[PDB]
Design a protein around this ligand. Structure first.
Ligand SMILES: CCCCCCCCCCCCCCCCCC(=O)OC[C@H](COP(=O)([O-])OCC(O)COP(=O)([O-])OC[C@@H](COC(=O)CCCCCCCCCCCCCCCCC)OC(=O)CCCCCCCCCCCCCCCCC)OC(=O)CCCCCCCCCCCCCCCCC
Ligand SMILES: CCCCCCCCCCCCCCCCCC(=O)OC[C@H](COP(=O)([O-])OCC(O)COP(=O)([O-])OC[C@@H](COC(=O)CCCCCCCCCCCCCCCCC)OC(=O)CCCCCCCCCCCCCCCCC)OC(=O)CCCCCCCCCCCCCCCCC
Ligand SMILES: CCCCCCCCCCCCCCCCCC(=O)OC[C@H](COP(=O)([O-])OCC(O)COP(=O)([O-])OC[C@@H](COC(=O)CCCCCCCCCCCCCCCCC)OC(=O)CCCCCCCCCCCCCCCCC)OC(=O)CCCCCCCCCCCCCCCCC
Ligand code: HEA
Ligand code: HEA
Ligand SMILES: CCCCCCCC/C=C/CCCCCCCC(=O)OC[C@H](COP(=O)(O)OCCN)OC(=O)CCCCCCC/C=C/CCCCCCCC
Ligand SMILES: CCCCCCCC/C=C\CCCCCCCC(=O)OC[C@H](COP(=O)(O)OCCN)OC(=O)CCCCCCC/C=C\CCCCCCCC
Ligand SMILES: CCCCCCCC/C=C\CCCCCCCC(=O)OC[C@H](COP(=O)(O)OCCN)OC(=O)CCCCCCC/C=C\CCCCCCCC
Ligand SMILES: CCCCCCCCCCCCCCCC(=O)OC[C@H](COP(=O)(O)O)OC(=O)CCCCCCCCCCCCCCC
Ligand SMILES: [O-][O-]
Ligand SMILES: [Cu+2]
Ligand SMILES: [K+]
Ligand SMILES: [Zn+2]
Lengths: 141, 226, 75, 147, 107, 141, 459, 62
C-alpha cells in the first residue's frame, strides 16, 4: 500500500498538491545532477550534422555510434582513452538490467555486477577531466 | 497561479552558503522549532542522505521514506485545510463561480478574518440578478433577499493562528527517530572520495559537523573577498 | 531512431476546447485578389489620368448605331 | 510555447573548476547545457539528439519495487531502469500522478441554528416562492399602469 | 430583462393550511447620530463606531437564516466613515453556472 | 511580438491557458468539464464545487505553469515563429536597402538633370520665364 | 501627515475641500457681476476701471469650470468611491494621485496672485485672439495656470483608465461615466495644449499666427475642439452620480444599464465632432454649417434616452420611504433642470436661431441651468449620498427642505430672466446696457443676493 | 506569500483607561453639543437601509 503525500513547490509563494511518494523520490533523485547523469545516444544522420559545427566531436561521436554507446558529452571528449572502460561499462549495465528485470516480483536483492567500471558509483566516482578549451595552434603558419 | 510572478532561483533550491553552520544542532531541533531556512536544510540533508543510499531504499517503507524526505502523509484533516488554503489563494486573482447555494450546501466563502464582502448575482440565465453586496460575518447562515441563495463563511483559523502550509505541517506531522549523524558520515564517504564530491551538500554538512574548515578545499571554499 | 529538425516542423494547432480559437473562416490572413485588383486599378487610373488629359472633358456628339436605347450605347 | 522556447531558468556547466563568467575575461571557454551539450552545437541539432537518464545500477531494485507496488507506475520505472527515460517521459510520469487537494464539507462548523429553527426551512422556502410569484406579477401590472 | 426568479406551482403548495406570509419587521430600528461617550478615548470611540454599523446588521427568519443588509454597489459595504484600508480580503462576486466535475462528489 | 498581451503574448509571466499538446490526455488535458455527465442523485457533494484547484485539470495547469519555468534545453520554435518575431526588424532593414539602392540613384539623376535643364526630368518645362527648380512631386501638382 | 498622504480617499476629500475654497472666490466674482448689472450706470466698478469687469467675468468662467466643478465632479467624488466601486484596495497610481491635487492648488495660487500683482484686464474665458495676444502679463499667467491644470487633468485621466486593468467586479454605469470622460480628456487635451502653445508663441515668441494672413478663426477651431468635449467632461460624471442615487434611494435596479452605458459612449463620440456650433457666426461654408447643425441635434437622441431611463427609476418606488431627503430632491431636480438647459441648447443649435442668440444672455442662462444649477446640484447630491461614508458633520443639509426650495426658486430667478433679455437683446460680456433692460437685469440681481444668503444657513 | 503584508490582523487592545485622582473617569473633548433652548420636537424619517431594510432615523431638537 502506497500512501499519498503533500508535495510543495516554491520558496516564498508555495503551491501544494498531492503526489505519489515514489514519484517524488524519483524526482529528487534526478535532481542529484552529480549522481544521475543524462547520456546521449547518436544516429548516423545526427553525427554527420555535428561535423558542420565541430569536426573533432564528429569523429569522437562516430566512435560512440559505432559501438552503440550512451555516453556523456564530457566523457565523449576523452573517448579515445575511455573506450575500453566504456565497453566494459556497457556490458555491466546490461547484465544488471537483465538481472533485475528477470527477478521474480518481491525480490529486491542487488544485482551482481562489476561496479568498478560504472561511473558514477561509489566504487568508481570518476576522473578529474582536464579542460580541453586550450588553443594549440600558431596563427602564423 | 496566474496572479503569481515568475519563479525565483530560490523557488527551486537554496544556495549552500545558506546552510546553517551548526549542523549538529540543526539535525536535533524539533520541527516546530525550525525556521524556514533551517527546515529547508534539515529536509534536504536528511532526505538526500536516504536517497543516496541505494542499498537501503528497497527495505524502507513509504511511511519512513516520506518522513526522511520531509513529505507529509495526507489525511482528511490536513487535506481539508490544505485544500481550503489553495482555494483561498486561487480566489485572490480568479473569479468566484460555482453551483447555486442551498441550505444543504451553502456557498463556501473562505476568509481569514471574521468577515468578507460577498456579492450575490442570483442563478443562471434569467434567474441572474444585479449584484447584491453584503458583509458575510461568521456564525450566520446568510440568505439572499432576492433569490434565497444560502451563503456561509468558512474561517481558516486554528489555535490563535490562520491556516498555512507551515501550520498544517507542524500540527499533523510527527518527528520520527532522531537523525543519526553516522548516516551522514557514511553516505558522505560513499559519494565523496579522493577529491571527487558527488554529494556537495553532504561535504559541506560533514565539514560543519567537523567544525568548519576540516575537509580538503573547504577553507578555500569559505574564504570570500567581499 | 529518426527525428525532425524543429525549425521546419509545422505550427501547432489551437487546442480544441469549449473556448476554441478559429481563424480559418475569417479570410483576414492575407491580402486577397480583390486587394490586388484595387492596386491594379489605382495604377491604371494614375496612368490614364496623365496619358489622356481630355477624358474628363468628353464630346457630346454621339452617333450610336442602333440608337441610344441599345445596350452597347451605354458603354 | 512561452518566451520563445527560452526557459526562464536553466543549468549551465563549465569545464574549468575555477571558472567565473563575471571575473574572467578569457575567450576560449565554451559553456555547456544541463545535458552537457557544448554551446557551439546549436539547439536545433542537440534537441534532436536523444538524452536519457542513467541512474547507478544499485537503484534498479528500488525502481523495481516502485513499479510493483504501483502497476500504473511500472512502465515509467521500466524505462528508467532500461535507460530509455527522456526528460519528456519524466514529465509525463510526474504530472500523471499529481492529484488535487480534497475539501470535506462534513468538517465545516455550521452557524448556530436551533432545532426549532431547522424544522421551519420548508416554510421559509415557501414564503420565498410566493414573494417571487407576487413580484413577477406586479411587474406586469405596474408596467401597464405607468407606461 | 430581470423579472424575478421563476416559480413552479409545486413550490407554492403549503405543508399546512394555516401557513401565511411571515410578518418579520425589516426596519432595523430607531437611529440617529452615533452618540459617543465623553469618557471614551479615541481608541474606545473607534470601537463604538465599529459597533454601530448598519451594514453589519441583519434580520433572522423563522428558520434561523438571516437576510443581511444588502446594496446594489460595494460602496455601502465599507465601515462608515471609510477606514484607511478597506478591502484587505478581496470581495468575492459569486457567479452561478450549471457546470460540475466529478471530483467534488463522492458515492 | 513586441507588445505584451495577457492572453496571447504573455511573456512577463509565461502563463498558458492550456497544457502542451505533446502530453497525453491521460497525463494532462485542457481544463474543460463542460461535457460531464449528469451527477447521480445518490452522490453527495463533498467539496465546495467552486471552480478552482479542487478540479484536477486546473490544479495541473497551475502546477505546470510554474514547473515549466525550468527546462534542460530550449524548445526550438519553427522558422515561421522566428520570422514573425523580427518581422519589423527585417522589413526596416530592407527599407533601408531600398532607400540606398533605389531612391538614391534616381534622386541623384534628377538633381544632375536639374542642373542642366533647370527643372527635374519628371516635370514640364516652363515658358513663363520664372526661374528655379520648381516642384518635385509632379503628381501632386 | 497632511500633504504627503497618498490615500485615494483622503485625496478625494482634498479635491472637494479645495473646490469649496476656490468656489468662494468664484461666487464672489459672480456677486460682483450681478451687483454691477443691477441698473444702468456705474455701481461698484468705475468707468475708468472697466478692465476689471472684463477680468472678473474671465476669471469667474475659468475658475468655475477648471478649478471648481471639474475638480469636484471629476476629482473629488471619483477619487473617493471609484476604487471602492471597483472592489480594489486603492487607486492604481498612488503617487500620481497625490501630485495631481498639489498641482491644482499651485495653479490656483498662480492665478489669484496674478490678480493681485498684474494689471487687471480680461479677454473672456475663451481667450480669443488677437485680443488675448495683445494684452498684458496677466494673460501670460492665466495661460500657465491652464497648462499646469492640463497636466493634472491628463495624469488623473491616466489614473482612472488603469482601473480597467485591476477592476475585480462589474463596471457599473458610474465607472463607465468616468472612463469615458477620461478618454475624452486624453483625446482633447493634447489639441488644447497645442493651440495654447501657439497663443504663447504669439504672446512671448514673436510668432505671427494671429496677425493678418494668419487665420484667427484657426484658434477657435482648435479651442472648441476641446471646448465642447469639456462641457461633456463636466456633465458625464454628474450623469453617473444621478444613476447611482436614483437606483439606491428608490431601491430599484438601473433600467437599461447597457443603454445607459451605450448612451454615454455615444454622447462622447458625438461630442467630439460637433464643436463648430460655437463658430456659427464666423462665416463658415454652408455645408459645414449644415453638417455641424445636423450632428449637434443628434446628440439629443442618446441624451434623451438617459433622461427617460432615469424617470422610470423614480416611478413606482415605495411610498413608505421618506422622499424629503436632500440627496433625492437634488437628483430629481437635476432631471427637471437639465431638460430646460438641454432644450434651450437645441434651440440655439439651429444656426439661424443662433444668429440672433449668439453672444447674448440666452447663452448664459443656457449653460448656467446645466452647470450652475445642474452640475452643482449633482455634486451636492453625490456628496450628500456619501455623508455617512465621508463622515463630515457640522452642517444642516441632509434633511433641509427649506434649503432645497429656496435654492431652486432663487436660482431660477437669476437665470430665467436671462433667457428673456436674450430676445431684448442684451449682449454678453458687457457691464453697461440700455435703460429698457433694467427690469429683467434687476430681477436677476435680486436673485443672486438671495442665493448667497441661503448658502449661510447650512452652517 | 510568506512575510508579506498580512491580509488580516487583529486589533491590539486599547490603551489603559484614565481616571482622575478622585476616581472620576477622565473625559475627552467631544463635539456633540447639547444646545440650550426650549424646543423639544423629534422628527422621524423612514430611511433606506440597503435594498431590503429600512431604519427609522430621528432628529432631535436638542
Ligand atoms: C500620424 C502619426 C502616426 C504615428 C504612429 C506611431 C506608431 C508608434 C509605434 C510603432 C511601433 O513600434 O509599432 C510596431 C509594433 C508592432 O506590435 P507587435 O506586437 O510586434 O505586432 C505583431 C504583429 O504586427 C501582429 O500583431 P497583432 O495584429 O497580432 O496585434 C498585436 C498588436 C497589434 O497592434 C499593433 O501592432 C499596432 C500597430 C500600429 C502601427 C501604426 C502605424 O497589438 C498592439 O500592439 C496593441 C497596442 C495597443 C493599442 C491601443 C489603442 C488605443 C486607442 C484605441 C482607440 C480609442 C478611441 C476610440 C474612439 C472611437 C470610439 C468609437 O507596435 C506596437 O507594439 C506599438 C503598440 C502601441 C502603439 C500606440 C500608438 C498610439 C495609439
Ligand atoms: C543663493 C541661492 C542658490 C540657489 C538655491 C536653490 C535652492 C533650491 C531648492 C529647491 C526646493 C525648494 C522647495 C522645497 C520643498 C520641500 C518639500 C518637502 O520635502 O517637504 C516635506 C515636508 C514634511 O514636513 P515635516 O518636516 O515632516 O513636518 C511638517 C509639519 O510637521 C507639518 O506636518 P503636515 O505636513 O502634516 O502639515 C501640513 C498641513 C497641516 O494641516 C493644517 O495646517 C491643518 C489642516 C488643513 C486646514 C485647511 C486648509 C485648506 C484646505 C485645503 C484642501 C486641499 C489640500 C490639498 C493637499 C495639501 C496641498 C498643500 O498644513 C500645511 O502645511 C499646508 C496645508 C494646506 C495649505 C493650503 C490650503 C489652501 C489655502 C488657500 C489660501 C488662499 C485662498 O512637507 C511639509 O510638511 C511642508 C511642505 C511645504 C511646501 C510648500 C509649498 C508652497 C507653494 C505655494 C505656492 C508658491 C508660489 C507662490 C507663493 C507666494 C508666496 C508669497
Ligand atoms: C479588450 C479587453 O480585454 O478589455 C479588458 C482589458 C482588461 O482585462 P480584464 O481583466 O478582462 O478586464 C475586466 C473588465 O474590465 C471588466 O468588465 P466586465 O466583465 O464587467 O464587462 C465585460 C466587458 C464590458 O465592456 C464591454 O463589453 C464594452 C464593449 C464596447 C465598448 C464601446 C465601443 C465604442 C462604441 C461603439 C463604436 C461603434 C463605431 C462604429 C463605426 C462604423 C464605421 C463604419 O468588459 C470590457 O469590455 C472591459 C474593457 C472595456 C474597455 C473600454 C475602453 C474605452 C472605451 C471607449 C469607448 C469610446 C469612447 C469614445 C470617446 C470619443 C472619441 C472621439 O482592458 C484593458 O486591458 C484595459 C486597457 C486600458 C488602456 C487605456 C489606454 C488606451 C490607449
Ligand atoms: C455641461 C454644460 C453643457 C451641456 C450639457 C451642453 C449641452 C448642449 N449644448 Fe451647450 N454650452 C455650454 C455648456 C453646455 N452645453 C456652455 C458653457 C456654452 C457657452 C460657451 C461659450 O460660448 O463661452 C454652450 C454653448 C452652446 C452653444 C453656443 C450658442 C452660441 O454660441 O450662440 C450651442 C449651440 O449649438 C450649444 C448647444 C448645446 C446642445 C445642442 C447641447 C445638448 O447636450 C443638449 C442635449 C439635451 C437635451 C436635448 C434635453 C434632454 C433630451 C431630451 C429631453 C430628449 C428629447 C429632446 C429632443 C428630441 C430635442 N451649447
Ligand atoms: C460651472 C461654472 C459656473 C458656475 C457655478 C457659475 C455660477 C454663477 N454664475 Fe456664471 N459663468 C460661468 C460659469 C459658471 N457660473 C461661465 C463659464 C461664464 C462665461 C464667462 C465669460 O463670459 O467669459 C459665466 C458667466 C456668468 C455671467 C456673465 C458675465 C458676463 O460675461 O457678462 C454671470 C452674471 O450674469 C454669471 C453669474 C453667475 C451666478 C450669479 C452664479 C451662481 O453664483 C449662482 C448661484 C449658485 C451658487 C452660489 C452655488 C455655486 C456653488 C459652487 C459652485 C460650489 C460647489 C462645490 C461643491 C458642491 C463641493 N456667470
Ligand atoms: C546579360 C544581362 C546583363 C544585364 C546587365 C544589367 C546591368 C545593370 C546596371 C545598373 C547600374 C546602375 C547604376 C546606378 C548608379 C547610381 C550612382 C549614384 O547615383 O551615386 C550617388 C548616389 C547618392 O548620390 P547623392 O550625391 O547623395 O545624390 C542623391 C541624393 N541627394 O548613391 C547611390 O544611389 C548609392 C547606391 C548606388 C547603387 C548602384 C547600383 C549598381 C547596380 C548594378 C547592377 C548590375 C547588374 C548586372 C546583371 C548581370 C546579369 C547577367
Ligand atoms: C511654454 C509652455 C510650456 C508648456 C509645457 C507643458 C509640459 C507638460 C508636461 C506633462 C507631463 C505629464 C507626464 C505624465 C507621465 C505619466 C503619468 C503616469 O501615469 O506615471 C506613473 C508613474 C509611476 O506610477 P506610480 O504612481 O508611482 O505607481 C505606483 C504603483 N505602481 O509616474 C512616473 O513615473 C511619472 C514621473 C514624472 C511625473 C509625472 C507627473 C507629474 C507632472 C510632471 C511634469 C514634468 C514637466 C514639467
Ligand atoms: C474626434 C476625432 C475625429 C474628428 C473629426 C472631425 C471632422 C469634422 C468634419 C467637419 C467638416 O466638414 O470640416 C469643415 C471644417 C472647416 O470648415 P470651413 O472653415 O467652413 O472650411 C471649409 C472649406 N473652406 O473642417 C475643420 O475645421 C477640420 C478640423 C480638423 C479636425 C482634425 C481632428 C483630428 C483628430 C485626431
Ligand atoms: C482617416 C483617413 C484614412 C485614409 C483615407 C481613407 C479613405 C477611405 C477608406 C479606404 C480604406 C481602404 C483600406 C484597404 C482595403 C482593401 O484593400 O480592401 C481589399 C478588398 C478586397 O479584399 P481581399 O483582400 O479579401 O480580396 O478590396 C475590395 O473589396 C475591392 C476589390 C477590387 C475592386 C476593383 C474595382 C473597384 C471599382 C471602384 C469604382 C469606384 C467608383 C466611385 C464613383 C463615385
Ligand atoms: O457647448 O455645448
Ligand atoms: Cu459646444
Ligand atoms: K451697470
Ligand atoms: Zn441573490
Amino acid at each position: 500500500q502506497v500512501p499519498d503525500v503533500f508535495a510543495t513547490f516554491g520558496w516564498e509563494r508555495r503551491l501544494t498538491v498531492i503526489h505519489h511518494p515514489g514519484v517524488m523520490a524519483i524526482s529528487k533523485l534526478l535532481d542529484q545532477r552529480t549522481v544521475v547523469k543524462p547520456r546521449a545516444t547518436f544516429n548516423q544522420e545526427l553525427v554527420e550534422e555535428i561535423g558542420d559545427y565541430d569536426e573533432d566531436l564528429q569523429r569522437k561521436a562516430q566512435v560512440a555510434l559505432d559501438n552503440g554507446l550512451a555516453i556523456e558529452w564530457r566523457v565523449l571528449d576523452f573517448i579515445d582513452d575511455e573506450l575500453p572502460r566504456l565497453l566494459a561499462e556497457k556490458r555491466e549495465i546490461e547484465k544488471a538490467r537483465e538481472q533485475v528485470m528477470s527477478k521474480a516480483p518481491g525480490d529486491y536483492t542487488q544485482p551482481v555486477f562489476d561496479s568498478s567500471v560504472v561511473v558514477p558509483t561509489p566504487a568508481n566516482l570518476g576522473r578529474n577531466y582536464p579542460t580541453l578549451n586550450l588553443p594549440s595552434g600558431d596563427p602564423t603558419e | 497561479y496566474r496572479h503569481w510572478h515568475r519563479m525565483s532561483e530560490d523557488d527551486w533550491a537554496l544556495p549552500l552558503d545558506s546552510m546553517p553552520e551548526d549542523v549538529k544542532t540543526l539535525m536535533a531541533t524539533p520541527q516546530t522549532e525550525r525556521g524556514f531556512v533551517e527546515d529547508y536544510w534539515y529536509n534536504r540533508i536528511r532526505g538526500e542522505a536516504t536517497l543516496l543510499d541505494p542499498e537501503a531504499l528497497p527495505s524502507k517503507s513509504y511511511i519512513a521514506l516520506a518522513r526522511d524526505m520531509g513529505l507529509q502523509i495526507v489525511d482528511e484533516p490536513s487535506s481539508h485545510m490544505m485544500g481550503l488554503i489553495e482555494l483561498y489563494e486561487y480566489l485572490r486573482g480568479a473569479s468566484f463561480v460555482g453551483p447555486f447555494g442551498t441550505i444543504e450546501n451553502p456557498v463556501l466563502v473562505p476568509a481569514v478574518g471574521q468577515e468578507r464582502v460577498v456579492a450575490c448575482t442570483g442563478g443562471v440565465g434569467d434567474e441572474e440578478h444585479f449584484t447584491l453586496w453584503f458583509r458575510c460575518r461568521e456564525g450566520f447562515m446568510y440568505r439572499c433577499g432576492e433569490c434565497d441563495q444560502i451563503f456561509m463563511l468558512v474561517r481558516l483559523y486554528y489555535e490563535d493562528r490562520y491556516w498555512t502550509q507551515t501550520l498544517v505541517r507542524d500540527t499533523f506531522m510527527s518527528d520520527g527517530d532522531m537523525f543519526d549523524l553516522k548516516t551522514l558520515e557514511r553516505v558522505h564517504k560513499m559519494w565523496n572520495k579522493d577529491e571527487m564530491v558527488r554529494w556537495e551538500v553532504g561535504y559541506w554538512a560533514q565539514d560543519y559537523v567537523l567544525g568548519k574548515g576540516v575537509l580538503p578545499g573547504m577553507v578555500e571554499e569559505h574564504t570570500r573577498v567581499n | 531512431y529518426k527525428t525532425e529538425n524543429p525549425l521546419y516542423k509545422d505550427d501547432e494547432p489551437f487546442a480544441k476546447t469549449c473556448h476554441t480559437f478559429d481563424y480559418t473562416r475569417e479570410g483576414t490572413e492575407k491580402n486577397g485578389l480583390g486587394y490586388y485588383c484595387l492596386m491594379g486599378l489605382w495604377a491604371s487610373i494614375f496612368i490614364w489620368d496623365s496619358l489622356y488629359t481630355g477624358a474628363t472633358m468628353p464630346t457630346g456628339v454621339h452617333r450610336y448605331v442602333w440608337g441610344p436605347y441599345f445596350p452597347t450605347a451605354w458603354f | 510555447a512561452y518566451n520563445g522556447g527560452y526557459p526562464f531558468h536553466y543549468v549551465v556547466q563549465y569545464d574549468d573548476p575555477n571558472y567565473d563568467c563575471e571575473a574572467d575575461f578569457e575567450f576560449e571557454e565554451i559553456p555547456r547545457d544541463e545535458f552537457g551539450v557544448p554551446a557551439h552545437i546549436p539547439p536545433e541539432l542537440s534537441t534532436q539528439i536523444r538524452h536519457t537518464y542513467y541512474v547507478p545500477p544499485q537503484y534498479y531494485p528500488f525502481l523495481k519495487k516502485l513499479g510493483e507496488d504501483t502497476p500504473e507506475l511500472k512502465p515509467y520505472t521500466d524505462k528508467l531502469i532500461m535507460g530509455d527515460m527522456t526528460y519528456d517521459d519524466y514529465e509525463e510520469m510526474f504530472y500523471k500522478f499529481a492529484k488535487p487537494l480534497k475539501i470535506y464539507r462534513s468538517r465545516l462548523p455550521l452557524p448556530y441554528r436551533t432545532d426549532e429553527e431547522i424544522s421551519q426551512e420548508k416554510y421559509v422556502n415557501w414564503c420565498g416562492r410566493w414573494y417571487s410569484y407576487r413580484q413577477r406579477l406586479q411587474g406586469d401590472y405596474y408596467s401597464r399602469h405607468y407606461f | 430583462i430581470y423579472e424575478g426568479q421563476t416559480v413552479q406551482e409545486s413550490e407554492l403548495i403549503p405543508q399546512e393550511d394555516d401557513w401565511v406570509i411571515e410578518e418579520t419587521n425589516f426596519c432595523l430600528g430607531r437611529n440617529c447620530y452615533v452618540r459617543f461617550r465623553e469618557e471614551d478615548d479615541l481608541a474606545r470611540r473607534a470601537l463604538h463606531q465599529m459597533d454601530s454599523q448598519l451594514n453589519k446588521m441583519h434580520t433572522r427568519l423563522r428558520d434561523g437564516t438571516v437576510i443581511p443588509y444588502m446594496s446594489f454597489h460595494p460602496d455601502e459595504m465599507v465601515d462608515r466613515p471609510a477606514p484607511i484600508h478597506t478591502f484587505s480580503e478581496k470581495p468575492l462576486l459569486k457567479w452561478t453556472w450549471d457546470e460540475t466535475y466529478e471530483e467534488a462528489y463522492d458515492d | 511580438k513586441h507588445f505584451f498581451t495577457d492572453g496571447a503574448n504573455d511573456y512577463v509571466t509565461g502563463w498558458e491557458n492550456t497544457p502542451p499538446l505533446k502530453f497525453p490526455a491521460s497525463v494532462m488535458k485542457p481544463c474543460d468539464y463542460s461535457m460531464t455527465k449528469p451527477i447521480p442523485k445518490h452522490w453527495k457533494l463533498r467539496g465546495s464545487g467552486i471552480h478552482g484547484p479542487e478540479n484536477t485539470d486546473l490544479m495541473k495547469l497551475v502546477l505546470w505553469n510554474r514547473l515549466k519555468q525550468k527546462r534542460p534545453q530550449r524548445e526550438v520554435p519553427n522558422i515561421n515563429y522566428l520570422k514573425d518575431s523580427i518581422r519589423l526588424e527585417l522589413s526596416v532593414n530592407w527599407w533601408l536597402m531600398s532607400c540606398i539602392f533605389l531612391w538614391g540613384p534616381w534622386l541623384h539623376w534628377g538633381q544632375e538633370y536639374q542642373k542642366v535643364h533647370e527643372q527635374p526630368p519628371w516635370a514640364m518645362k516652363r515658358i513663363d520665364g520664372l526661374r528655379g527648380e520648381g516642384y518635385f512631386t509632379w503628381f501632386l501638382e | 501627515f497632511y500633504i504627503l498622504v497618498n490615500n485615494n480617499k483622503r485625496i478625494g476629500i482634498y479635491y472637494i475641500k479645495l473646490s469649496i475654497i476656490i468656489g468662494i472666490l468664484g461666487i464672489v466674482l459672480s456677486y460682483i457681476i450681478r451687483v454691477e448689472l443691477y441698473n444702468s450706470g456705474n455701481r461698484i466698478i468705475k468707468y475708468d476701471n472697466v478692465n476689471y469687469y472684463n477680468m472678473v467675468i474671465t476669471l469667474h468662467g475659468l475658475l468655475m469650470i477648471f478649478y471648481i466643478i471639474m475638480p469636484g465632479l471629476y476629482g473629488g467624488i471619483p477619487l473617493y468611491i471609484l476604487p471602492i466601486l471597483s472592489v480594489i484596495t486603492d487607486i492604481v497610481l498612488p503617487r500620481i494621485n497625490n501630485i495631481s491635487i498639489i498641482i491644482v492648488l499651485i495653479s490656483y495660487i498662480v492665478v489669484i496672485n496674478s490678480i493681485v500683482i498684474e494689471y487687471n484686464i480680461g479677454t473672456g474665458w475663451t481667450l480669443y485672439p488677437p485680443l488675448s495676444i495683445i494684452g498684458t502679463v496677466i494673460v501670460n499667467m492665466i495661460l500657465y495656470g491652464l497648462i499646469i491644470i492640463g497636466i493634472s487633468s491628463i495624469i488623473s485621466a491616466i489614473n482612472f483608465m488603469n482601473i480597467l486593468i485591476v477592476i475585480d467586479g462589474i463596471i457599473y454605469v458610474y465607472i463607465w461615466s468616468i472612463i469615458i470622460t477620461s478618454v475624452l480628456l486624453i483625446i482633447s487635451l493634447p489639441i488644447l495644449n497645442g493651440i495654447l502653445l501657439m497663443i504663447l508663441s504669439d504672446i512671448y515668441f514673436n510668432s505671427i499666427y494671429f496677425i493678418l494672413n494668419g487665420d484667427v478663426v484657426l484658434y477657435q477651431h482648435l479651442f472648441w475642439y476641446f471646448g465642447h468635449p469639456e462641457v461633456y467632461i463636466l456633465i458625464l460624471p454628474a450623469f453617473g452620480i444621478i444613476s447611482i442615487i436614483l437606483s439606491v434611494l428608490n431601491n430599484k435596479i438601473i433600467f437599461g444599464m447597457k443603454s445607459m452605458i451605450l448612451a454615454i459612449i455615444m454622447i462622447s463620440i458625438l461630442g467630439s465632432i460637433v464643436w463648430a456650433h460655437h463658430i456659427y457666426t464666423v462665416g463658415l461654408e454652408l455645408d459645414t454649417k449644415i453638417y455641424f447643425n445636423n450632428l449637434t441635434l443628434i446628440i439629443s437622441i442618446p441624451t434623451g434616452n438617459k433622461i427617460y431611463n432615469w424617470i422610470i427609476l423614480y416611478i413606482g418606488s415605495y411610498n413608505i420611504l421618506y422622499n424629503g431627503y436632500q440627496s433625492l430632491i437634488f437628483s430629481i431636480m437635476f432631471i427637471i433642470i437639465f431638460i430646460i438647459g438641454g432644450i434651450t441648447g437645441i434651440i440655439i443649435s439651429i444656426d439661424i436661431i443662433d444668429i440672433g442668440l449668439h453672444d447674448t444672455y440666452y447663452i448664459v442662462s443656457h449653460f448656467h441651468y446645466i452647470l450652475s444649477i445642474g452640475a452643482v446640484i449633482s455634486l451636492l447630491a453625490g456628496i450628500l449620498l456619501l455623508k455617512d461614508i465621508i463622515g463630515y458633520y457640522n452642517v444642516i443639509i441632509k434633511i433641509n427642505k427649506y434649503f432645497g426650495l429656496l435654492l431652486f426658486i432663487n436660482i431660477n430667478i437669476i437665470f430665467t430672466p436671462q433667457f428673456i433679455i436674450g430676445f431684448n437683446v442684451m449682449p454678453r460680456r458687457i457691464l453697461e446696457y440700455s435703460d429698457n433692460i433694467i427690469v429683467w437685469n434687476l430681477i436677476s440681481s435680486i436673485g443672486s443676493i438671495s442665493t448667497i444668503l441661503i448658502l449661510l444657513s447650512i452652517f | 506569500r510568506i512575510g508579506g503584508p498580512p491580509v488580516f490582523m487583529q486589533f491590539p487592545p486599547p490603551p489603559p483607561k484614565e481616571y482622575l485622582a478622585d476616581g472620576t473617569p477622565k473625559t475627552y473633548p467631544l463635539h456633540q453639543p447639547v444646545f440650550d433652548h426650549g424646543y423639544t420636537w423629534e422628527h422621524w424619517y423612514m430611511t433606506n437601509a440597503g435594498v431590503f431594510h429600512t431604519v427609522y432615523y430621528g432628529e432631535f431638537a436638542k
